[PDB]
Symmetry: none
Subunit: 240 residues, 2 copies
């Protein structure tokens, strides 16, 4: 059985695309035939979206040789065990000719596992080598995490304002939180809105505002980073 493919490496050059590179196996044990590549979605982290990123977080801490025996130890055992030298599915494709391939139409900003196998002329009967495998994330759709529609607003008691806006239907990965920028003459005030609040309310109530006219904007943070700010929101607090 051939070795696993060597030097499996990959990148994403486009949203919905991944490029993958590797080297032929160290020991063909026969004339090499082909490689088999498999890939599997990793899930969007439910473990992560449980965290309230508007809550606390930790402080960022700043700002002569002979030991190849360590393999002989296994090879000699294997040679004495034999007699003598004589959440999601895998997708799969099999390599024709070259130690490179590109996978496309992937979920944008999803993480994938990729497995690559290397097969010799006898692998058709013996089977192919085990996989070498890697993880990579697809490019974000730039601004796809920006707010997919208009903001809406309503007054609330105690000179409060509730702002209502649609959630992005597809994030880059996840919607973590929203930022609200707002103020009377100028948008001095800034608020962090957790995903759990939006999930409850579909929005947030800004409360106990000082009197006056106001403007605002909101910005989402996806796992690909901040989205765009909303269009401005215009609102007012009556003195009377």
């Amino acid at each position: 059985v051939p070795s696993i493919p060597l030097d499996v490496l990959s990148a994403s050059n486009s949203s919905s695309q991944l490029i993958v590179k590797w080297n032929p196996p160290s020991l063909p044990n026969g004339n090499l035939s082909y490689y088999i590549v498999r890939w599997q979605r990793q899930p969007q982290d439910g473990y992560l979206y449980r965290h309230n990123y508007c809550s606390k977080d930790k402080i960022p801490i700043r700002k002569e040789k002979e030991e190849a025996e360590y393999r002989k130890v296994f090879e000699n055992f294997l040679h004495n065990s034999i007699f003598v030298p004589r959440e999601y599915p895998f997708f799969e494709s099999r390599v024709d000719n070259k130690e490179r391939t590109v996978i496309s139409n992937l979920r944008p900003f999803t993480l994938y596992r990729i497995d690559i196998h290397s097969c010799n002329h006898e692998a058709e009967k013996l089977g192919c080598s085990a996989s070498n495998f890697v993880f990579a994330r697809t490019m974000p759709a730039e601004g796809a995490d920006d707010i997919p529609g208009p903001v809406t607003w309503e007054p609330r008691p105690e000179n409060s304002i509730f702002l209502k806006w649609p959630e992005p239907e597809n994030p880059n990965g996840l919607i973590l939180m929203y930022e609200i920028k707002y103020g009377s003459q100028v948008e001095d005030q800034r608020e962090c809105v957790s995903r759990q609040e939006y999930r409850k309310y579909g929005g947030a109530k800004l409360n106990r505002l000082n009197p006056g006219n106001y403007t605002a904007r909101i910005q989402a943070t996806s796992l690909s980073g901040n989205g765009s700010w909303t269009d401005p929101v215009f609102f007012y607090v009556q003195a009377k």
Copy 2:
């Protein structure tokens, strides 16, 4: 049961059941190529003599599924100087093993566990000796594992201090310094000194899980009584037991032999059996028939506020006989970057796709302790290593490390009473004293306050306290109120104040 004299386990989890009755393993353990055919648990296992090997175990997610109580590895014999090897554990995601209290002999090797989290959440220097010999490579990048402890204790990990965890559910449990070098039971009552790890009762050689020196008839003991003899480096056995043990089938298979009060399968180098096959070895009188480098591996810790311990290895190129090392150290300034930022409002976002040099000189050995230190200062350490000729050429360039002192416990708690005043719009202004000697710095304050219960919390920056000496709470509802405040020091949160009681009238 004491299983042995050597276990090679491979292929199937149903063979793993052989441990159902084992609690100590005499000889090696091999665990190879397992990939599931399921739960299995072996809390009976507590001590391994010799080494542990795991190799290409797919299907296993964490070792705390199997061996929560594996408390000591003696390592009396080693795989190429390793007492533990973990290799290619393609699905291993956390160690667990959360009762692991000591590894006596041997180095550590940890390789290609590309999904293994909880890599550096363990203070290896608390468990094992020459950690400089460890090897941790190709595993899951800790920067992107993003380990978590709950929220359990923290310690001066090299230049850092950080929380210590075996896994998200278990911290790297250890005794207080009230036991010193002594072990302890779970509620920190110190063990017997001959004991190792936890004890079902303190100071009782009959209540040990394992013995450091030797074992006999349920008793941990420093050395074998006269008619009792050292066996496999861990227990005493009588003269006639080893006389009844037959070695591996071989042309030279013979009974065991007794020497220095050890029992052995064959005589040690420089000794041979007496010609009667014999119980004793005898020595053969003839030959038996057939400029410095920088210092290495500089490492340091704080056991105590105002103290630092530093350990290192001899230099790579003595270029002579080595004479000694010269250590210099200097107080580093606390980062001026840190003072300006409003950590009560900065959060960042994720993304993916001035002081003197001291000098002292070492006589003989690569260890020293420095004292009368600032209880929470960061120090740069420069170590020079000098051979006999560094006197004329000058001495080597430095190998260097950073370390921070053990924080002064409660030095960051609020030193005096809180004061309060009314303000308009049903507002309250709170003024309170700054800690005199904060562990480095006070970054911010948390205020806990409320009418019936302290639902509301606020963060106060050090700059705000410098301007106002306090903070104003505004547009409260009427009623009676209580509050407390908490500081965040660089050493972490301080203590809460005693409660503050105050009230807001509606008019």
